[PDB]
Ligand binder design. Structure first.
Ligand SMILES: [Zn+2]
Lengths: 1087, 131, 246
């Protein structure tokens, strides 16, 4: 067995038939990436990190989110729960077909009262639940728990929410609502129908044991019109041909379609949310040809990737994103460090080990030992240069981590800056009259050019100057510092000697060797360069302060060939070594600087320097030709991409000295709150290396004696691209950018920031959130998004470190001359924030469905036999600020007792003192400031007196207590319980007292009510007396026809929805069925 | 179907001439070595959330790093004395800060946690029944 | 964190006695995070080192110690017995040592009188081979500095203070720890920003008389930069019975 497409070998036909699916060929999974080479039999595959056996399989360590999740049940989010059950006689009881009886099934609960609630995904059959559910009980229950989650940590009442945080809680609730419906509809099977009312329609069938139990719920016209009821009037008003499947695709997969549009029970809000999510995912679609191109281009021309595939249209694999999103990601990754070296250690070390594994270069100090094997000294001569340099180089030690870490640090110039260790410099400054200090200087000057320290040249020059004190003098620029200032201390551009940048101030008669060393530094110091990498056309690029396709390098690179002279002094590093050795010869020749050497050592020093110069190393060749190639080969595959800052040789005026991250917008002036990146003396986090190890690695190195670069790099590139996770990191960058925009919008929604948000929820009361409050709110938002997308890694963690009230991100550094480069990624739109603003839009009009009431309440006795439903009061019972004869009370409400029979009095807002009677207008704040003292003076007056108070609510949750309208009822118990339980930090649900409708005549008993709303909040009421011909006493309500537009309205297009004002039920849904194949490739060697 | 959750949420046909692949090749860089190194480089980056507020409002800082990192370097390079160190370098990096559990989001000291502070500030205003 | 108390703190017995209820701290609970430190040998080294040096130098040196940074001495025998140990069991030789010296020590000759090896040993000094080498005349400030930076320190004498002393060679060639976020022990320091001293106990009432001298000297010079915290503050931060000790 074998696949003639990818040329893989298979064992069983049930394996071949499941393998061809990854190429797209049908027949009659666990793998996430499938690669196969062509010069050998060794396929490589990856699996998730919960794969429970990596049996010859690799792993995805990336915390990849889950973007594609499917739903098979219907797509509504609004139940219709019966509140007061009922049973009525009926004429027609069932249907008959020659011998049979089919029971009538109604689409809606036949009860005396039915109203809408909000239970997200109550009929969903999901393969991976987001777990961000918003489950709401019926109004007769207590829904106060939905509004005391975020910042109600210590409220005394176990039930009761803080009124100052309703807006924050509602915003989090809407976020959960949107974030729990982010699914993608399935394409479950159908079934031809022949019911006498639905002729020849094709009805969807939910997956499960039995499916006919859902037809009555889904298709309201399925029920006929057998009885005289409100439901039967509704069904007789509906139209009939809008039922079942509506339209299906032309592409078919066997005998079933690819997608369909079907009429069924749903809501416009959820269908719109899922349509927007589907559009967002579809915009990220990618092509196997493009994956082929991107990998072939990342490989730098050593191997060629090929991924064949069959022609299909229903294939989804979202991986395309924007440079703006990837830059915002990289900015958050840079915030994460925060001067913590533990976070940056493993990156550099692991990259160093990877370089050591995939590099052809080998290092043995036996080259140095062999070349020094012949130099020896005569007895009775106790000073040996060869022995000294051997003992100081330590060729026996074989730890060269400094070399590879110095290489890996070139990619991370902006976060970490590598410097040569302090203990590598000569002791006490050193002296030119000392052989050990001479060799120390040699090692140091030969190792300096490989560090990203911005001021290496000044350190080299001043090392030699410090050694040269007493024999040569250079001019000083102030009276404080001297020529013997330690060379460690020159670590910032403001310390560069003014005689270093202008050579002409070093007189050749007074400091000849210092002038020579200066000229050598200025002329032959290595020149920076830059090389291309990655594939910006498919993957994009995360570069911030560089163009999106270049990779800065502190040295020069050339095209690679192994047939290079091992000693050409046109190479930067080899010429540097030759120049340093020549200068040390010039220092040692005349013995002008070593008075005290009785023995003549010119010949020995010159011999050892000639041997060190004409050495047989290939490390310079490597660093010039093959090191940049493999750096560019590794770069696009790293978890934390390269974050560089420009390399400048000696241009002091444009040396980077500070990297900072901004969090506020540009047209604002706030507290200057610098990020923690700006507190480093260097540009990044300092890192010390070993000059001895760097010099030994740079001075002894060779290739294998049978190297063939094509074979070598093909074999080194296959396993490490077979273990790539760029495609997971791209999706994670998507999610990070979305979360950033969402947090910005929501936090501006409550705090005070210049960012425009359109302010859709301003009537819900709340407070001006401070730094701590906004930070805890953002923590809730963060953890919610993590839970919804199944993430365990960081996300928005660095943004929560002090004042999360942000407006936008930006990163910038500043040159020595004061210029700054400010980079501000243009953050694109975010589907999550757009959907949250849409759901706030729908909430503003239909808030009752979530258990909220708008306006305020009016406490005061009302006794009568009327049945006017306190959630919809008549006009004469409500008064406002414009009503004549009303008193308004501010915070300054002081009570004074009446003496000797005079009534007590309270202070009006206008200073007047008034008795306890009439119409008052409280803010809720007064009663909440002191509920204790207030409901000892007012209770006896509100209960049996003439007082009538209007507490200014704003938003308030409510609870319903249905009573029998044919018996006595008195709501004083509920009213007094509410008033007593209110507290300075919480309020319980406002208890109302609603009568019960009836389809027949009833008696009338006196009812006494003490709380009534001030505007129509009875909007969640769906229908009353559903199974009777009409309602004769009580609040009347028929089926809301405007929520069934496409059924009851003849001239309504099938896709028309009046979304902002009313959420339609029975919409048009589109059902999909995609394939998500793995990433397959066929690496081919290059001749 | 039914993908499991992985984080705690809110709750004639004959053998043909070509098919013959047994042996005769051993890669030059080494598949196993390159795969192990690639894994170690593939590990994602550490999460530094000390100083950020938890879900109840208290800053969840741990409440040093250079020494810990150089010790990890020594352990990972298998030598008692590290060679690529992060502390005691030549630079006087004496103004550098870091995230700490000692500082809340209001720029204030974190000695009494924010939950306790809010509880006390609210308890200092409550009343009771009259006798 | 680190806290200093006027008492000889030990990791064995001071947990049994506590010392924190002693000074008046309400640490009593399942605390198990206030880990003590061994300062017995440090007090003994201080006493032995005041015998030769001067009290001001010794105390002002020992005050700059980072007790939360593990380190250790290890003393070398003198040059003669050192070379005898280089020779016998020669596979321990550091590579710094001279090529000629190694090539001559690798020989099985009696070494009764090697005319050149005598010169090679005469011109050999210990200071160049082992880099951090304290001294016979260290003038101890560099001792505490080297203990602060590094893991192992090389001494040629016994008068040292700050950490334990380990042997280099076998006994023939001579004459006759985890952290817990609330480390405590005597001998305050000002190495870090988190070193604190527990106030509330007068100086004239300290009974050890070496801890007493140390506290007087350090508190009369570093008064303005020490972090004082009372027993109540320590309590808030945290949250063979001997007779004749009351
Ligand atoms: Zn295949």
């Amino acid at each position: 067995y074998q696949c003639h497409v990818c040329s893989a070998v298979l064992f069983s036909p049930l394996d071949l038939d499941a393998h061809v699916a990854s190429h797209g060929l049908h027949g009659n999974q666990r793998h996430i990436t499938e690669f196969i080479s062509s010069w050998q039999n060794h396929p490589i595959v990856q699996v998730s990190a919960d794969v429970e056996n990596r049996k010859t399989a690799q792993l995805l360590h990336a915390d990849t989110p889950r973007l594609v999740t499917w739903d098979a049940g219907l797509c509504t989010s609004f139940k219709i729960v019966p509140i007061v059950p009922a049973q009525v006689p009926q004429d027609v009881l069932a249907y008959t077909f020659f011998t049979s009886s089919y029971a009538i099934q109604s689409p809606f609960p036949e009860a005396a009262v039915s109203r809408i609630v909000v239970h997200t995904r109550w009929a969903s059959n999901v393969d991976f639940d987001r777990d961000s559910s918003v489950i709401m009980a019926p109004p007769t229950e207590n829904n106060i728990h939905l509004f005391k989650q975020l910042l109600n940590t210590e409220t005394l009442s176990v039930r009761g929410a803080n009124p100052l945080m309703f807006r924050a809680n509602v915003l989090h609730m809407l976020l959960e609502f949107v974030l729990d419906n982010l699914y993608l509809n399935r394409h479950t099977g159908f079934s031809q129908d022949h019911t006498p009312f639905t002729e020849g329609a094709n009805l969807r069938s939910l997956p499960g044991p039995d499916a006919e139990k859902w037809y009555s719920i889904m298709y309201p016209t399925r029920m006929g019109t057998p009885n005289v009821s409100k439901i039967c009037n509704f069904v007789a008003s509906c139209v009939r041909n809008r039922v079942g499947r509506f339209d299906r695709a032309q592409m078919m997969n066997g005998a079933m379609s690819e997608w369909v549009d079907v009429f069924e029970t749903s809501d416009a809000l959820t269908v719109s949310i899922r349509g927007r999510w589907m559009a967002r995912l579809a915009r990220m679609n990618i092509n196997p040809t493009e994956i082929e191109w991107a990998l072939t281009e990342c490989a730098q021309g050593y191997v060629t990737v090929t991924s064949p595939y069959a022609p299909s249209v229903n294939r989804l694999m979202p991986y395309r994103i924007s440079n703006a999103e990837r830059q915002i990601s990289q900015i958050i990754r840079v915030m994460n460090i925060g001067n913590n070296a533990t976070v940056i250690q493993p990156v550099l070390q692991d990259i160093s080990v990877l370089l050591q594994r995939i590099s052809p270069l080998q290092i043995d100090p036996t080259i140095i030992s062999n070349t020094m094997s012949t130099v020896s000294e005569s007895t009775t001569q106790t000073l040996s240069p060869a022995s000294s340099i051997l003992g100081k180089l330590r060729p026996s030690n074989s730890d060269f981590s400094s070399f590879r870490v110095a290489l890996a640090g070139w990619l991370y110039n902006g976060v970490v800056t590598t410097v040569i260790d302090d203990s590598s410099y000569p002791k006490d400054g050193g002296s030119v009259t000392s052989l050990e200090n001479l060799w120390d200087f040699f090692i140091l000057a030969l190792a300096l050019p490989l560090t990203t320290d911005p001021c290496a040249p000044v350190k080299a020059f001043m090392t030699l100057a410090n050694m040269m004190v007493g024999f040569e003098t250079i001019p000083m620029d102030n009276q404080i510092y001297t020529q013997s200032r330690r060379a460690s201390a020159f670590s910032t551009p403001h310390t560069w000697p003014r005689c270093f940048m202008n050579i002409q101030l070093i007189s050749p008669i007074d400091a000849p060797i210092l002038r020579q060393w200066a000229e050598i530094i200025h002329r032959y110091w290595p020149n920076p360069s830059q090389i291309r990498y990655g594939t910006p056309n498919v993957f994009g690029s995360a570069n911030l302060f560089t163009p999106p396709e270049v990779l800065l390098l502190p040295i020069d690179h050339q095209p690679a060939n192994v047939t290079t002279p091992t000693l050409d002094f046109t190479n930067e590093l080899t010429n540097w070594r030759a120049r340093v050795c020549e200068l040390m010869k010039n220092l040692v020749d005349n013995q002008r600087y070593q008075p005290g050497w009785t023995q003549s050592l010119v010949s020995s020093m010159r011999g050892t320097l000639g041997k060190l110069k004409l050495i047989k190393s290939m490390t310079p060749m490597y660093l010039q030709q093959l090191a940049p190639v493999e750096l560019a080969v590794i770069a696009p595959m790293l978890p934390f991409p390269p974050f560089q800052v420009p390399y400048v040789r000696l241009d002091r005026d444009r040396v980077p000295t500070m990297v900072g991250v901004t969090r506020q917008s540009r047209d604002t002036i706030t507290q200057p709150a610098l990020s923690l990146s700006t507190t480093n003396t260097t540009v990044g986090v300092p890192l010390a290396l070993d000059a001895r190890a760097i010099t030994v690695a740079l001075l002894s190195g060779k290739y294998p004696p049978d190297l063939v670069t094509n074979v070598w790099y093909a074999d080194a590139i296959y396993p490490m691209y077979a273990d790539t996770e760029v495609f997971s990191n791209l999706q994670r960058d998507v999610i990070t950018c979305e979360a950033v925009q969402t947090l910005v919008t929501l936090v501006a929604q409550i705090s005070e920031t210049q960012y425009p948000v359109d302010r859709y929820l301003d009537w819900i009361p709340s407070l001006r959130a401070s730094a701590a409050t906004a930070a805890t709110f953002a923590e809730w938002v963060n953890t919610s998004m993590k839970t919804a997308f199944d993430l365990s890694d960081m996300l928005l963690e660095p943004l929560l470190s002090g004042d999360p009230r942000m407006t936008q991100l930006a990163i910038q550094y500043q040159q020595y001359n004061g210029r700054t480069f400010n980079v501000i990624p243009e953050m694109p739109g975010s589907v999550i924030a757009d959907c949250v603003q849409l759901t706030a839009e729908v909430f503003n009009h239909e808030y009752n469905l979530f258990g909220i009431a708008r306006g305020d309440i009016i406490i005061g006795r009302v006794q009568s036999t009327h049945l006017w439903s306190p959630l919809a009061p008549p006009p004469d019972l409500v008064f406002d600020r414009d009503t004549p004869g009303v008193h308004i009370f501010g915070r300054d409400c002081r009570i004074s007792f009446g003496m000797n029979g005079a009534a007590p009095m309270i202070r009006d807002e206008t200073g007047m003192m008034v008795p306890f009677e009439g119409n008052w207008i409280f803010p809720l704040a007064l009663w909440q400031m002191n509920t204790r003292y207030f409901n000892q003076q007012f209770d006896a007056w509100i209960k049996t007196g003439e007082l009538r108070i209007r507490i200014e609510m704003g938003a308030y949750p409510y609870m319903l207590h249905y009573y029998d309208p044919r018996q006595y009822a008195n709501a004083w118990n509920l009213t007094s319980a509410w008033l007593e339980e209110i507290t300075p930090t919480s309020i319980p649900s406002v208890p109302f007292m609603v009568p019960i409708s009836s389809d027949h005549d009833i008696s009338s008993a006196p009812a006494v009510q003490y709380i009534i709303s001030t505007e129509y909040n009875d909007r969640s009421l769906f229908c009353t007396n559903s199974s009777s011909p009409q309602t004769i006493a009580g609040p009347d309500k028929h089926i809301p026809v405007e929520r069934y537009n496409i059924l009851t309205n003849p001239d309504a297009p099938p896709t028309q929805i009046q979304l902002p004002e009313v959420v339609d039920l029975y919409n048009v849904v589109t059902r999909y069925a995609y394939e998500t194949p793995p990433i397959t490739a066929v690496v081919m060697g290059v001749p | 179907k039914r993908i499991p959750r992985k984080t705690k949420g809110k709750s004639p046909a004959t053998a043909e001439p070509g098919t013959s692949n047994c042996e005769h090749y051993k890669a030059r860089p080494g598949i196993a070595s390159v795969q192990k190194a690639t894994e170690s480089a593939e590990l994602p980056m550490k999460n530094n959330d000390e100083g950020t507020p938890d879900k109840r409002g208290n800053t969840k800082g741990a409440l040093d790093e250079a020494d810990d990192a150089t010790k990890k370097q020594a352990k990972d390079t298998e030598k008692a004395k590290a060679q690529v160190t992060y502390s005691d370098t030549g630079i006087n990096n004496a103004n550098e800060l870091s995230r700490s559990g000692n500082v809340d989001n209001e720029g204030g000291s974190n000695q009494k946690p924010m939950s306790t502070r809010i509880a006390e500030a609210t308890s200092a205003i409550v009343s009771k029944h009259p006798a | 964190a680190y806290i200093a108390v006027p008492a000889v703190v030990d990791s064995r017995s001071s947990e049994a006695i506590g010392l924190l209820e002693s000074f008046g701290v309400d640490a009593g609970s399942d605390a198990n995070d206030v880990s003590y430190q061994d300062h017995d040998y440090v007090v003994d080294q201080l006493q032995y080192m005041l015998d030769g040096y001067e009290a001001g130098d010794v105390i002002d040196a020992l005050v700059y110690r980072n007790w939360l940074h593990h380190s250790v001495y290890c003393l070398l025998p003198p040059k003669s017995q050192l070379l005898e140990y280089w020779k016998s069991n020669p596979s321990v030789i550091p590579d710094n040592v001279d090529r000629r010296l190694r090539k001559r020590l690798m020989l099985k000759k009696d070494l009764r009188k090697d005319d050149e090896y005598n010169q090679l040993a005469r011109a050999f000094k210990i200071s160049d081979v082992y880099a951090p080498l304290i001294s016979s005349t260290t003038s101890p400030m560099t001792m505490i500095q080297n203990l602060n930076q590094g893991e192992i320190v090389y001494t040629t004498t016994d008068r040292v203070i700050g950490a334990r002393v380990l042997l280099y060679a076998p006994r023939k060639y001579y004459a006759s720890v985890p952290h817990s976020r609330f480390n405590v022990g005597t001998f305050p320091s000002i190495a870090t920003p988190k070193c604190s001293v527990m106030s509330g106990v007068d100086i004239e009432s300290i009974p050890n008389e070496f801890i007493k001298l140390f506290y007087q000297r350090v508190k009369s010079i570093h008064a303005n930069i020490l972090n004082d915290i009372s027993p109540q503050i320590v309590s808030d931060m945290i949250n063979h019975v001997d007779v004749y000790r009351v």
